Scaffold this active site. Sequence first.
Site, PDB file in Angstrom:
ATOM      1  N   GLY A  92     -27.489  24.069  72.567  1.00 21.87           N
ATOM      2  CA  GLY A  92     -27.160  24.619  73.865  1.00 21.87           C
ATOM      3  C   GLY A  92     -28.282  25.426  74.485  1.00 21.87           C
ATOM      4  O   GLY A  92     -29.456  25.064  74.371  1.00 21.87           O
ATOM      5  N   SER A 107     -30.699  22.159  67.203  1.00 21.70           N
ATOM      6  CA  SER A 107     -31.758  23.164  67.277  1.00 21.70           C
ATOM      7  C   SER A 107     -31.225  24.594  67.262  1.00 21.70           C
ATOM      8  O   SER A 107     -31.597  25.401  66.402  1.00 21.70           O
ATOM      9  CB  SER A 107     -32.589  22.932  68.542  1.00 21.70           C
ATOM     10  OG  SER A 107     -31.766  22.956  69.694  1.00 21.70           O
ATOM     11  N   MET A 108     -30.341  24.921  68.204  1.00 21.35           N
ATOM     12  CA  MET A 108     -29.784  26.268  68.236  1.00 21.35           C
ATOM     13  C   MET A 108     -28.802  26.473  67.092  1.00 21.35           C
ATOM     14  O   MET A 108     -28.768  27.549  66.483  1.00 21.35           O
ATOM     15  CB  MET A 108     -29.103  26.523  69.579  1.00 21.35           C
ATOM     16  CG  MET A 108     -30.007  26.341  70.794  1.00 21.35           C
ATOM     17  SD  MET A 108     -31.561  27.258  70.724  1.00 21.35           S
ATOM     18  CE  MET A 108     -30.980  28.909  70.346  1.00 21.35           C
ATOM     19  N   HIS A 144     -35.534  20.560  67.116  1.00 23.75           N
ATOM     20  CA  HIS A 144     -36.450  20.021  68.111  1.00 23.75           C
ATOM     21  C   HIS A 144     -36.981  21.168  68.960  1.00 23.75           C
ATOM     22  O   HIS A 144     -36.415  22.264  68.980  1.00 23.75           O
ATOM     23  CB  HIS A 144     -35.783  18.939  68.975  1.00 23.75           C
ATOM     24  CG  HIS A 144     -34.492  19.362  69.608  1.00 23.75           C
ATOM     25  ND1 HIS A 144     -34.401  20.418  70.490  1.00 23.75           N
ATOM     26  CD2 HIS A 144     -33.239  18.863  69.492  1.00 23.75           C
ATOM     27  CE1 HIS A 144     -33.149  20.549  70.890  1.00 23.75           C
ATOM     28  NE2 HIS A 144     -32.422  19.620  70.295  1.00 23.75           N
ATOM     29  N   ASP A 167     -37.862  15.301  67.049  1.00 29.60           N
ATOM     30  CA  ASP A 167     -36.531  15.286  66.441  1.00 29.60           C
ATOM     31  C   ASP A 167     -36.595  14.916  64.965  1.00 29.60           C
ATOM     32  O   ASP A 167     -37.171  13.893  64.592  1.00 29.60           O
ATOM     33  CB  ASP A 167     -35.615  14.302  67.182  1.00 29.60           C
ATOM     34  CG  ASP A 167     -35.546  14.567  68.677  1.00 29.60           C
ATOM     35  OD1 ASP A 167     -35.389  13.597  69.448  1.00 29.60           O
ATOM     36  OD2 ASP A 167     -35.643  15.745  69.079  1.00 29.60           O
TER      37      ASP A 167
END
EC number: 3.4.21.92
Lengths: 131, 342, 272, 192, 192, 192
Positions: free
Chosen positions: D67, D96-97, D121, D170
């Site tokens: 997000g 990622s987050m 990423h 990624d």
Amino acid sequence: GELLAQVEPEDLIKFGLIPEFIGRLPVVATLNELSEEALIQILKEPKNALTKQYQALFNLEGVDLEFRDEALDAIAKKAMARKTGARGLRSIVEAALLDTMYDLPSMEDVEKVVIDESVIDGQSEPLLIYG
Amino acid sequence: LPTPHEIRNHLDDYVIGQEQAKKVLAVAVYNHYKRLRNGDTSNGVELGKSNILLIGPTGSGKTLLAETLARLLDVPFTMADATTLTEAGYVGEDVENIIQKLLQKCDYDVQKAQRGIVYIDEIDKISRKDVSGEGVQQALLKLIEGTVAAVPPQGGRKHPQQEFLQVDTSKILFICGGAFAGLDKVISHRVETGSGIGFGATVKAKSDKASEGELLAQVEPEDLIKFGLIPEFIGRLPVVATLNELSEEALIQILKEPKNALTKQYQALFNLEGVDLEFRDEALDAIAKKAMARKTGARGLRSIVEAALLDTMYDLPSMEDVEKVVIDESVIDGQSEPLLIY
Amino acid sequence: ADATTLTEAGYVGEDVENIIQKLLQKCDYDVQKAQRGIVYIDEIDKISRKSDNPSITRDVSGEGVQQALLKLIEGTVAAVPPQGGRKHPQQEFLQVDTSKILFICGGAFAGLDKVISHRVETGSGIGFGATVKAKSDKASEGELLAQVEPEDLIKFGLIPEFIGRLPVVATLNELSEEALIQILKEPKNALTKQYQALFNLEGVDLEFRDEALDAIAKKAMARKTGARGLRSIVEAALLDTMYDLPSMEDVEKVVIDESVIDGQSEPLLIYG
Amino acid sequence: LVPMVIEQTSRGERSFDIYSRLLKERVIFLTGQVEDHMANLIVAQMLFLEAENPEKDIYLYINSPGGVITAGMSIYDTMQFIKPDVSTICMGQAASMGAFLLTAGAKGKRFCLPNSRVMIHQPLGGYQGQATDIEIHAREILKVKGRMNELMALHTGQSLEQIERDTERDRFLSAPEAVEYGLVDSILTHRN
Amino acid sequence: LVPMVIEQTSRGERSFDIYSRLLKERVIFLTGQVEDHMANLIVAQMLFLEAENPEKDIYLYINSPGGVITAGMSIYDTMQFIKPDVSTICMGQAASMGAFLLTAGAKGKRFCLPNSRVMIHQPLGGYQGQATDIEIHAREILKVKGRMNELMALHTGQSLEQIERDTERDRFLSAPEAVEYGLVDSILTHRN
Amino acid sequence: LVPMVIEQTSRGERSFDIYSRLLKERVIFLTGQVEDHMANLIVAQMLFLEAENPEKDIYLYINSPGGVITAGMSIYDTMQFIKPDVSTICMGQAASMGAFLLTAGAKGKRFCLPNSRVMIHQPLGGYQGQATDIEIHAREILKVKGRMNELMALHTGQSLEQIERDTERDRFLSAPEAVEYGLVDSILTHRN
Ligand SMILES: Nc1ncnc2c1ncn2[C@@H]1O[C@H](COP(=O)(O)OP(=O)(O)O)[C@@H](O)[C@H]1O
């Protein structure tokens, strides 16, 4: 009866009884309500049997009284539904023979009385022997 | 006078375990009797009463400990249920009736009643949310600290055309016992560090119920406050004891170790007629396992044993030339009857 | 007397007149002595109303008890049986006037401090329009109770007529370490002195230390158990000591240290 | 609809939502896209638990396809600031987050389920405007990438250059690979 | 609208919704598309029941036309993680994710209604972008298929080759056919 | 909105919604299109009533223009599974799926209003994609058509051939015609 077999003193304590008293009695015995066959024996086996009591009354009047095993079975079945015990048997007989005793002495030339299972249910009427 | 060790050994004969709890009761009784016996109070200092609090799960032999102490002494003993009690103006149960029961045990002897040891059972189930609730407990306040109580002259229903005797409760020791459900959870949040309902949080699946008893030993007044008890009652009870629950190993001891043991009673009955009775170790362990499986408790153990011996004791007097009776696992399950020696 | 036991007339609960009966027992059923006697009442807050202003149903244990005590405190004849109605003819129920009988009421009030704090709390309104900042400072429970007035008691569930019978009101404060420390040794029947006598009769001497009393006081106020909590800590520290003290002998003095209370030490025994 | 559960206590029965009930036991749920509105809700839950018990650890369940980075920084900084140790568990997935907050938990209290997936990423952002304005925005995204890598390296324990190379494009790490890379410490395969 | 039911207890009478009442009996409802929000709700209910009594089995009713895989794996790993056994029951339809969780129940405690249908198919996913990025995403979904097929064979008891071929294309398995396949142990037709 | 009603009990009065009050009397409402959410709600009510009293009858009111078949089969199997007899009443309309549930009612406990409409038609569905994929999906719907018709013939009592012929096209049967067909057992006109 199965539930009574699986009884423990804790159950009595839950009812609201003191535990000390329950502990004084470490032995417990269970019973069971009379069955169809048991009621039949109780109806005639005792000396002061219900059937014998009515037979004496009919004999006192001078008429013989007879009972059928099939009719007795229905009486036991009705008592179980009422679940009133042995005392309820007297009520069942009184209800079926209420109309009979009302007009029994009125009739004449009667030597014996026969009761059928249908008479107990109320559909049929008591058979009378004339001769 | 008897020392605490004497009471300890005495209770050990009729009780297995509860070492810490046994020490508390012995010390309290010994100290209380010294205060009672030393009524002269030669020194200017005036002695003060002490109360006992018992916390243990159901079937922990709490009533057994109270009965054993009462049996070991000549003072009267009484048992009561706190749930039955109600506040004034209600159906009719009052705290005054508690003293009445004590007087009945000592034949309405006021002097003897003062030395009696009162006991309370099932203190739980009554607490703050009209309904009585905590109000019932409030009536007990004056009783614990000590106050005069009006009781009928000969244990009869309260009548206006009669006088009520006064009994001072300032010297009557009070033992409050009860089974608390959920207190362990409150204590765990306070002392133990766990995430409760969590993926990585510890759960009570290990089946090590012994930990629960140990946790109760760390009970504090704050924990009781969370339960809902008013701080007056917690303060009125300075002495607190904890009783752990029974285990399969401990239960096996109760079957034979106590003087008035279940197995010993049957053995005495069997050998009285001249037929020996032997309880196999496997059968004894299975009996305890069955009770724990069905959570019947110590009381249910008697019924389990009675089932197997009932049939055996009925046919034993019939034949003769019987030397010994051997009970096995099959006898407990009921697959086969116990064998006899001829 | 116990206020909880009292109930309205015509109920199973104890009657209010029974309180005067107890006083007669002390003076051997002397009406004259009882007329000048003193009476103390405890836990008077229990009979207070619990949001019973609408009066949905009469409360015999609450508001009802207050109404009965209205005229009794002021003064009036009380019909109490001399010997529980010995004989029906010529009963001659004792008439004990309470016009000169002093009455003292006592009870712990929970929530009263908040009521007083709300009244003392300033602030006419919220927002820019408010001309007063409504600044307030924390105050102790004893300090708030000192500012108590009859209006505050009325909101607690007390009838105005009842409080009017008690003109003088006295308040009490909490305890501190210094107070608890002094209570352990200064009073005649102190907790520490009681244990000393219990040990002296067995030919054993007992001594305490200032550091020990400090830990005792801190533990008592930490548990929020009041002065009664002291006994719980003392007995818990000397439990093992007295559990086996009668067994051995040749012990003359015992000394208690601060570490003993903490549970990481044991009492020191001195042999003669 | 959210089901209701009843917690039985000595005081008496009470009703709580399933999410609310778990919150009482120091369990916070991170689900869906990360935004300012849900992050403030998690931050409040954390601060509320810190006051109740600053010594009891906190458990955070993460299941989300990443997000906003801004919202994650408010959560990451809140876990490192409070005294209690925050445990992170990856359920389903962690972008990622979700992965940055997963590895940002207390060392030795980071878990991952057997079939959970992880993804890391670089920050994705764009701006439209004048060439001068684009220069300012371009600098920030590059700086965010550098700061994020350093924080990941610190918690994961890998070298800063290694984190940058792995996060450049990624990369998908399974539960065993996550343990090997240091994102998590162990895999809670079974109850015991 | 959800109806409210009244439950009689020793403490008193309490009103709960129909879904909350069944939760007390260790029953969970899995309906609709599989997403992160509904999956996290099921996980909370599972952990909540484990704490109450981790000895009684849990019943899971599955009726859904599949969904995302990440949300489903959080439920699969949770069912295997918790100590008590999770009994899966199929009502209506059961797609890939509905079937992967149905067959993932404890052996001997899997059921299916007589008219209920089942369906098994391989993972569906797509990515658009650079050729290099396409390779990373393409390999990722393929690995998920292998993990799902491996677990499917383990639970079903069928050979891995059979699972791969059967799941290559949509395979509609009737309740009797499903028992032969091993997805469900038995078919519940009438009570007792 | 939904109005509230009062139930006068010996202890005190309780407030319930119009749909919850009727549920206590073993009455379930089937309104609107059939789907997974509404079907799972009816299933829970059926099971909740079976536990309260597994001997008393249950009444199911049906008024809906059909819907999904998979959602309906979960209701049919639930009716035949539980011991109590499920009474079906048709109010206004009964489409293909509604008709299947209506005929599924216990023998001698099926009723319909005088001004009630019934409709029976073969299952409708469509799929798009590869030719091979189309064939497998076509087989499932054909099997469903046979299974539905077979079950329809059983409860209705008409021959399977007759059912196949009549259900080939939409057939609107009025309340009297429905009795002749055998979908119902009697008609309710006035209260006796
Ligand atoms: N520690 C123990 N030692 C000996 N007997 C015990 C013990 N705990 C329980 N019992 C047995 O359990 C029986 C019932 O105990 P109970 O009074 O129910 O305990 P509680 O009051 O804690 O519920 C008693 O007859 C007693 O013999």
